[PDB]
Design an enzyme around this catalytic site. Structure first.
Site, PDB file in Angstrom:
ATOM      1  N   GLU A 261     -28.796 -24.880  13.474  1.00 33.60           N
ATOM      2  CA  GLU A 261     -28.993 -25.276  12.085  1.00 33.60           C
ATOM      3  C   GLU A 261     -28.507 -26.701  11.825  1.00 33.60           C
ATOM      4  OE1 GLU A 261     -27.578 -22.210   9.324  1.00 33.60           O
ATOM      5  OE2 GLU A 261     -29.711 -21.768   9.043  1.00 33.60           O
TER       6      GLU A 261
ATOM      7  N   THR B  26     -15.087 -20.786   7.338  1.00 31.44           N
ATOM      8  CA  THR B  26     -13.893 -20.222   7.964  1.00 31.44           C
ATOM      9  C   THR B  26     -13.369 -21.065   9.124  1.00 31.44           C
ATOM     10  OG1 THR B  26     -15.305 -18.739   9.275  1.00 31.44           O
ATOM     11  CG2 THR B  26     -14.309 -17.844   7.278  1.00 31.44           C
TER      12      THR B  26
ATOM     13  N   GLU C  38      12.056 -27.522  -6.251  1.00 29.47           N
ATOM     14  CA  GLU C  38      12.409 -27.367  -7.658  1.00 29.47           C
ATOM     15  C   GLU C  38      12.397 -28.701  -8.397  1.00 29.47           C
ATOM     16  OE1 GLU C  38      16.254 -25.499  -7.350  1.00 29.47           O
ATOM     17  OE2 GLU C  38      15.406 -23.495  -7.651  1.00 29.47           O
TER      18      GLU C  38
ATOM     19  N   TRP D 165      26.825 -37.110  -8.720  1.00 33.84           N
ATOM     20  CA  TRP D 165      27.823 -36.442  -7.894  1.00 33.84           C
ATOM     21  C   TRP D 165      28.460 -37.441  -6.933  1.00 33.84           C
ATOM     22  CZ3 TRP D 165      23.561 -32.341  -6.996  1.00 33.84           C
ATOM     23  CH2 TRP D 165      23.565 -31.431  -8.058  1.00 33.84           C
TER      24      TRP D 165
ATOM     25  N   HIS E 283      -3.841  -8.788  24.410  1.00 30.96           N
ATOM     26  CA  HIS E 283      -3.857  -9.870  23.434  1.00 30.96           C
ATOM     27  C   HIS E 283      -2.958  -9.490  22.272  1.00 30.96           C
ATOM     28  CE1 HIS E 283      -6.471  -7.344  20.924  1.00 30.96           C
ATOM     29  NE2 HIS E 283      -7.151  -7.097  22.029  1.00 30.96           N
TER      30      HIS E 283
ATOM     31  N   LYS F 181      29.823 -13.865   4.612  1.00 35.00           N
ATOM     32  CA  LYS F 181      29.852 -13.510   6.028  1.00 35.00           C
ATOM     33  C   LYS F 181      29.604 -14.710   6.937  1.00 35.00           C
ATOM     34  CE  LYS F 181      25.163 -12.370   7.529  1.00 35.00           C
ATOM     35  NZ  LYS F 181      24.313 -11.347   8.204  1.00 35.00           N
TER      36      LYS F 181
HETATM   37  N1  ATP Z   1     -10.150 -33.262   8.622  1.00 40.56           N
HETATM   38  C1  ATP Z   1     -10.101 -32.028   8.061  1.00 40.56           C
HETATM   39  N2  ATP Z   1      -8.976 -31.581   7.457  1.00 40.56           N
HETATM   40  C2  ATP Z   1      -8.911 -30.359   6.896  1.00 40.56           C
HETATM   41  N3  ATP Z   1      -9.936 -29.486   6.882  1.00 40.56           N
HETATM   42  C3  ATP Z   1     -11.125 -29.802   7.450  1.00 40.56           C
HETATM   43  C4  ATP Z   1     -11.275 -31.120   8.086  1.00 40.56           C
HETATM   44  N4  ATP Z   1     -12.533 -31.170   8.562  1.00 40.56           N
HETATM   45  C5  ATP Z   1     -13.135 -29.988   8.262  1.00 40.56           C
HETATM   46  N5  ATP Z   1     -12.296 -29.171   7.596  1.00 40.56           N
HETATM   47  C6  ATP Z   1     -12.597 -27.799   7.102  1.00 40.56           C
HETATM   48  O1  ATP Z   1     -13.453 -27.085   7.997  1.00 40.56           O
HETATM   49  C7  ATP Z   1     -14.298 -26.212   7.245  1.00 40.56           C
HETATM   50  C8  ATP Z   1     -15.661 -26.072   7.907  1.00 40.56           C
HETATM   51  O2  ATP Z   1     -15.497 -25.525   9.212  1.00 40.56           O
HETATM   52  P1  ATP Z   1     -16.725 -25.471  10.247  1.00 40.56           P
HETATM   53  O3  ATP Z   1     -17.900 -26.193   9.637  1.00 40.56           O
HETATM   54  O4  ATP Z   1     -16.199 -25.951  11.576  1.00 40.56           O
HETATM   55  O5  ATP Z   1     -17.086 -23.911  10.427  1.00 40.56           O
HETATM   56  P2  ATP Z   1     -17.872 -23.073   9.303  1.00 40.56           P
HETATM   57  O6  ATP Z   1     -17.852 -23.850   8.013  1.00 40.56           O
HETATM   58  O7  ATP Z   1     -17.368 -21.653   9.341  1.00 40.56           O
HETATM   59  O8  ATP Z   1     -19.374 -23.102   9.880  1.00 40.56           O
HETATM   60  P3  ATP Z   1     -20.640 -22.751   8.947  1.00 40.56           P
HETATM   61  O9  ATP Z   1     -20.724 -23.933   8.014  1.00 40.56           O
HETATM   62  O10 ATP Z   1     -21.790 -22.651   9.920  1.00 40.56           O
HETATM   63  O11 ATP Z   1     -20.266 -21.466   8.251  1.00 40.56           O
HETATM   64  C9  ATP Z   1     -14.408 -26.803   5.849  1.00 40.56           C
HETATM   65  O12 ATP Z   1     -14.185 -25.783   4.874  1.00 40.56           O
HETATM   66  C10 ATP Z   1     -13.318 -27.852   5.763  1.00 40.56           C
HETATM   67  O13 ATP Z   1     -12.406 -27.536   4.710  1.00 40.56           O
HETATM   68  N1  ATP Z   2      27.910 -34.899 -12.839  1.00 40.09           N
HETATM   69  C1  ATP Z   2      28.337 -33.629 -13.050  1.00 40.09           C
HETATM   70  N2  ATP Z   2      29.568 -33.382 -13.550  1.00 40.09           N
HETATM   71  C2  ATP Z   2      30.004 -32.127 -13.764  1.00 40.09           C
HETATM   72  N3  ATP Z   2      29.275 -31.026 -13.506  1.00 40.09           N
HETATM   73  C3  ATP Z   2      28.021 -31.124 -13.002  1.00 40.09           C
HETATM   74  C4  ATP Z   2      27.472 -32.465 -12.739  1.00 40.09           C
HETATM   75  N4  ATP Z   2      26.232 -32.281 -12.250  1.00 40.09           N
HETATM   76  C5  ATP Z   2      26.005 -30.944 -12.200  1.00 40.09           C
HETATM   77  N5  ATP Z   2      27.070 -30.252 -12.648  1.00 40.09           N
HETATM   78  C6  ATP Z   2      27.164 -28.771 -12.732  1.00 40.09           C
HETATM   79  O1  ATP Z   2      26.391 -28.182 -11.684  1.00 40.09           O
HETATM   80  C7  ATP Z   2      25.533 -27.157 -12.188  1.00 40.09           C
HETATM   81  C8  ATP Z   2      24.150 -27.309 -11.565  1.00 40.09           C
HETATM   82  O2  ATP Z   2      24.241 -27.086 -10.158  1.00 40.09           O
HETATM   83  P1  ATP Z   2      23.157 -27.700  -9.137  1.00 40.09           P
HETATM   84  O3  ATP Z   2      22.126 -28.464  -9.936  1.00 40.09           O
HETATM   85  O4  ATP Z   2      23.948 -28.426  -8.079  1.00 40.09           O
HETATM   86  O5  ATP Z   2      22.440 -26.461  -8.391  1.00 40.09           O
HETATM   87  P2  ATP Z   2      21.741 -25.229  -9.156  1.00 40.09           P
HETATM   88  O6  ATP Z   2      22.249 -25.170 -10.569  1.00 40.09           O
HETATM   89  O7  ATP Z   2      21.846 -24.015  -8.266  1.00 40.09           O
HETATM   90  O8  ATP Z   2      20.200 -25.682  -9.222  1.00 40.09           O
HETATM   91  P3  ATP Z   2      19.211 -25.016 -10.303  1.00 40.09           P
HETATM   92  O9  ATP Z   2      19.178 -26.037 -11.414  1.00 40.09           O
HETATM   93  O10 ATP Z   2      17.901 -24.859  -9.572  1.00 40.09           O
HETATM   94  O11 ATP Z   2      19.886 -23.724 -10.690  1.00 40.09           O
HETATM   95  C9  ATP Z   2      25.491 -27.299 -13.702  1.00 40.09           C
HETATM   96  O12 ATP Z   2      25.738 -26.037 -14.334  1.00 40.09           O
HETATM   97  C10 ATP Z   2      26.582 -28.294 -14.053  1.00 40.09           C
HETATM   98  O13 ATP Z   2      27.602 -27.663 -14.834  1.00 40.09           O
HETATM   99 MG    MG Z   3      17.900 -26.835  -7.406  1.00 41.96          MG
END
Ligand code: ATP
Ligand code: ATP
Ligand code: MG
Ligand code: ATP
Ligand code: ATP
Ligand code: ATP
Ligand code: ATP
Ligand code: MG
Ligand code: MG
Ligand code: MG
Lengths: 489, 439, 506, 49
Positions: C64, C37, C305, C318, C217, C444
């Protein structure tokens, strides 16, 4: 032997498919379960199948059940154990205590028992040994710590002999520890769990292989059934997607429907007749049944809604005579409540009835009646079971479903079976001028052209008569149409 | 050394990504799990991979399974340990009791075991040791407090030898205590938990690294599959959002459709064919499959609804000949029920089938077929797996979803996958003059 | 400060806010949690920060972990304890058992440990003490009643010396008892609970302060993250509602839209872009990112996405060239799956990238992508985090949300975020004569007038083109309108026959 | 009132209104000139010349 794990077939229906061949030869297999799961049976059926199918003698070690009862109880499934004992193919090693005795006999008998067990193995040339209720011997005065050593002694010794063993363990919780002392699981090379799950006041027997050291298997639970032919498992996931499919056509019983389907139903297909109550799904079912008897073919009607008598009445009122159908042995009716059993049992009753009547067509009246109370996931599994079975058996299947809401028709099926079926026949009510008129429509056919029109149809003494579509109407699917009237171009 | 903690690669598919380099050198790792989770394999596969990939000798300490069986069970995966024993690359240290057992071993034996190990380590110049089922040795008459010191003795002595160890521990509950005595967690420097979660009558195997003292790692459960190639882990959170993209267009099989898409589907894109049942997604999918063979490119149709024969029938009735495509070895159909396996397995089967066929197109018929029973999150997670894999593998993917309600779609995918989809092809029924026409 | 108890700063990011100033001086704080933890880290980082920031010598008692490992493991966070030990600023008190040890010791050693700690404290002039895993000492043969007297002895003596101690305890269940023997919770003055809550196969770390005797706290769980900089806590309830607000206007990249917003988006505001899939929310985001770099301002695009390459492709389609934007060091793209981590992590990565790039604009594509699987309450908490962080940093933020149902969606957002945002941009489909035409509407805006009209918009290679509204229509929002005609032939541009060409040569 | 279904009989398909008085229930005529009667709030016709 420098090869992979060789398995021995148990010939238990479905078990060898989940275990990918069966129990590993020369090793111990732990079969645990609660009271009344079928543990003792699984041990018995294991030895019996080895004798009758492979001439491999077996030794049965009982710690509680007397040898007389073991033979007595086995006669339920119609197999004489007393015969195999006389033939020296089976030896029931009585290890059950007597009503009197003494104590302070911990591992004293365990060492003595091993000599008694190895005795029967060499003497009877045994290849299979099933030890029933191994727990009952530790139920004297022991802890987990003590049971582990006594078990590992027995297992290791049996592995040295080169004998394939099955060990029975008893449980308290269905999903708690696999074994009583939480030790047996790790002493055994293989773990098999028998479950008798409750839920909904019903019972569902399931079998799972937790592990088989050194091999693969199918993961998860699988429903089985204890019958007059022993344990019967249905690996509904093992069934392959390789069903035969032809272009052969068959009549629906309704000539106009055959035209609407582009020449009739496919012989290798599944048909779905969905509609509200009163629409006439049971009519199409009856009609579909008679046509099978007109060509002198066998077919089965599985009714879950109406009785055997009432079915005859409603059918005769539709002209068709079901009485003659039974006499000619071309039609067989079952009739049983869905609440009479579980889906695992019904799936078997259907399968069993099919093999005894070799039908060319089949009609299950109301799948929705079978989905009563049962979860969707358990019901959807039942469908795939029946659907796939009839599919790979070249049997044309007509299934009936009643949509919970009439008019508006939100989705064909509430339980979503429309993706499993091949042909969808849709019945619906159509409110025209204060009257509840009907409408039939072939919603889809995967291989045929089929009609796109929503044609009305009335019902009389002659049966179903399909008429013309509502060309001059709008919002017909909604149930409450709107005649717009052409004023007029 | 006066820097960070050095790690040792396990070469296990996916694990080294999760552990950010592998197991820390000079420390013991606790691998715990219930019965049948794959602990023994993880121990074996840890030693084997060390020998074969780094020429690092290994010592295997067994406390229950006889040494003959270790090599015997290993043959399933297609790796001969007996050869490694003969070559002196692997030493299986039998610490298992004799069938004629005796009493009291909790002081001279721990020192004895260490001596046997240390002797084995020095003799074979070992770098890796795997101790299987250390829990079994405390299973004589010990309590939690007594187990803590015995482990602390075992771990520390091995730590002095400079041996990177893997320790196997058994559980009782899948989400209960991490170990049996609820003590092993805090004694060990590193903790790894193998879970065999039930749910819905199916079994899902997951891998979690609880802690790596002194380093980082990937947090959470990760689904793995045990096959004939051992433990295969899918860190679905590790794969990066760096998919390749181009302006290249590919045909759909439907000429008019290609015009409706501005010149055809992109090669690096995910196409979604959604619509009610009977609308004709399988048709567009088939037509998408045939066009791949027309340009002599390989493609795979993943069907989960219709059989192999019915697919042939409906296709031939649509003119197109699937049979000829199979002979020319350009099209390969799998066909399997969704209930035949879990999503962790299906993902693998797909991935496995891809690498053995190197497709240019891929079509999975009915994703909604796979969404039967499975939770929404596990399904979405499965989608990411197949979607992200095909994108980075230069494979054009057309997916199929059947909307549960006909006429009144109101939602492309009610399971909301379309958010991760590039191109959406929508099919729907339209009531025209008492007739059901498509659109 | 208006607190009865004097506290000592831990300099751990966020904890001094939760503890309202830090740990009470002269008293013991119990930091407990399950395995992994971050218990040991909290005690280590507690001593380290005391040395580096206040030159307060620290004593570390290990029961330990070997002293060499404490130094070894600490190097991960870039901490040279070996130097601190060498400088006499840190003393690691080894009380760990033996690999070749006997049995039975947990009484006189407790009195001996007192004499050891008091020696280390007096010699090193220590002001901070960390006793890691005190539980393992009772893990010999002891019960709860024995623990209470021995802890109280250890604690009371430490209080007499005047040392501010941190005691680490281990647990079994995340939500069960606070400690193993269920006793430590009432012997200590302060109780801190570290949790590694599972749920949904992910791991979310939280820090909770159960009690501080004598002060206040922040109540409840607060998510923290362990990085290469140690423990990082997010007091998402301590964030005060006092952000700066101006009337300054910025361009949206789309000139016609700037008219629809009465002069463009506000600088100190939160913009919400909603609409069904395919409407074009990603498009407006791109244009919102380009205009910042066109005016030589820094901005970051957080995508969840689309990939980095596909973003480059679609943007170039675009017109806008994102490649040059990265070269000029004015635009930065992140791109990461929401399933790649938890909300606590994503929130930090976003906060981190901001501090490493000091943007003037921020853009998170699809908040609804981060709402995948996560409970609504946890997602809302994330939204408040990002929104609140960007608000007080004068960073204009454009957020994207994809409505799960197209045409006739009865709400802007399914998670009800429309009350946290300041400006709502609405996109939707409009079924016109068998064609799927789009439409944009400024729903809005808090400080401006904004256009009330629902104007349709076309998308081309040139980008979004805002045209005229559906005046002669009813049921627009429904998605499938009903055409009524009072005119449409009315003026605008009558005169039949010849009024156009197409064409000639150029 | 409407007989929605009868398994062995023909039964009326019409949705006829019925009155309640001191004499009891009396079923009368259907709503012929009405659409979406099932909906609860139907729409009349024209009742013109
Ligand atoms: N550089 C780092 N980046 C991300 N996470 C880290 C890094 N170093 C350690 N950790 C995380 O710290 C956790 C261990 O924490 P720590 O040993 O301080 O306490 P603890 O594990 O609860 O003690 P005990 O082992 O006595 O239960 C590991 O699960 C590891 O994922
Ligand atoms: N080069 C282009 N010419 C004409 N229409 C385009 C062109 N590129 C994208 N579109 C139109 O834009 C729409 C896609 O919108 P956009 O990818 O900007 O956001 P979105 O659709 O909200 O994203 P998501 O794919 O996550 O829904 C398509 O339906 C397409 O008809
Ligand atoms: Mg998108
Ligand atoms: N002819 C039969 N038809 C249907 N079910 C049967 C028949 N014979 C036995 N059974 C079922 O088998 C069950 C008993 O199985 P068996 O005694 O072989 O194993 P078990 O009950 O697990 O063993 P134990 O009694 O030690 O728990 C009974 O509950 C009974 O319902
Ligand atoms: N002799 C008959 N003459 C005319 N119509 C009949 C006759 N018998 C039944 N019907 C019609 O058939 C309808 C009942 O349909 P059927 O008996 O085929 O099964 P079903 O309605 O699908 O079954 P259920 O509604 O019980 O699920 C009734 O609404 C009734 O209008
Ligand atoms: N060739 C194989 N293909 C697929 N799965 C396999 C294969 N061999 C083994 N397995 C799987 O591995 C599991 C066994 O793992 P292993 O024996 O390595 O550790 P464990 O079962 O956790 O330890 P223990 O058996 O001591 O409880 C089996 O349940 C089996 O399903
Ligand atoms: N030979 C044919 N002639 C005309 N139409 C056909 C023919 N075969 C199939 N169809 C039409 O195609 C539709 C089925 O579509 P398809 O087989 O592509 O799969 P789907 O409907 O997308 O998926 P599912 O099989 O789950 O319904 C049917 O509704 C039917 O009307
Ligand atoms: Mg019926
Ligand atoms: Mg089809
Ligand atoms: Mg299909």
């Amino acid at each position: 032997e420098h090869q992979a794990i060789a398995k021995m077939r148990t010939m238990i229906e479905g078990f060898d498919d989940i275990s990918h061949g069966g129990l590993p030869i020369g090793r111990s297999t732990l079969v645990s379960g609660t009271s009344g799961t079928g543990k003792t049976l699984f041990s018995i059926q294991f030895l019996y199948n080895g004798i009758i199918e492979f001439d491999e003698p077996g030794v049965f070690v009982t710690f509680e059940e007397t040898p007389q009862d073991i033979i007595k109880n086995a006669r339920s499934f119609g197999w004489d154990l007393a015969k195999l004992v006389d033939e020296g193919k089976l030896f029931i090693l009585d290890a059950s205590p007597d009503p009197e005795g003494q104590e302070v006999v911990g591992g004293f008998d365990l060492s003595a028992l091993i000599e008694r067990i190895n005795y029967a193995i060499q003497k009877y040339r045994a290849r299979r040994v099933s030890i029933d209720s191994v727990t009952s011997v530790f139920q004297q005065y022991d802890a987990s710590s003590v049971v582990r050593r006594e078990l590992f002694r027995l297992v290791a010794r049996l592995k040295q002999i080169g004998a394939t063993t099955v060990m029975t363990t008893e449980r308290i919780e269905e999903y708690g520890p696999i074994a009583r002392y939480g030790v047996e699981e790790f002493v055994s090379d293989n773990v098999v769990i028998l479950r008798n799950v409750l839920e909904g006041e019903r019972r569902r027997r399931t079998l799972e292989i937790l592990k088989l050291r050194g091999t693969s298997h199918m993961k998860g639970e699988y429903p089985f059934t204890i019958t007059d032919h022993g344990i019967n498992i249905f690996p509904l996931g093992a069934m392959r997607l390789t069903q035969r499919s032809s272009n052969v056509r068959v009549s629906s019983g309704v000539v106009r429907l055959d035209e609407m389907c582009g020449g009739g139903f496919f012989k290798d297909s599944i048909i779905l007749a969905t509609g509200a109550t009163g629409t006439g799904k049971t009519l199409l079912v009856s009609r579909f049944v008679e046509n099978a008897c007109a060509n002198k073919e066998r077919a089965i009607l599985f009714a879950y809604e109406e009785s055997r008598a009432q079915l005859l009445r409603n059918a005769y009122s539709w002209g068709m005579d079901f009485e003659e159908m039974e006499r000619q042995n071309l039609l067989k009716i079952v009739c049983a409540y869905p609440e009479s059993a579980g889906l695992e049992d019904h799936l078997q009753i259907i399968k069993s009835e099919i093999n005894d009547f070799k039908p060319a067509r089949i009609a299950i009246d109301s799948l929705s009646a079978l989905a009563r109370g049962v979860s969707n996931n358990a019901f959807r599994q039942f469908v795939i079971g029946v659907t796939g079975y009839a599919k790979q058996e070249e049997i044309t299947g007509l299934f009936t479903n009643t949509s919970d809401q009439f008019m508006g028709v939100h989705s064909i099926t509430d339980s979503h079976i429309s993706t499993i079926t091949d042909t969808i026949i849709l019945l619906q009510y159509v409110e025209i001028r204060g009257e509840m008129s009907r409408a039939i429509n072939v919603f889809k056919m995967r291989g045929s052209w089929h009609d796109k029109a929503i044609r009305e149809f009335m019902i009389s003494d002659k049966g179903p008569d399909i008429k013309d579509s509502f060309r001059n109407f709008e919002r017909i699917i909604s149930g409450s149409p709107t005649r717009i009237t052409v004023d007029e171009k």
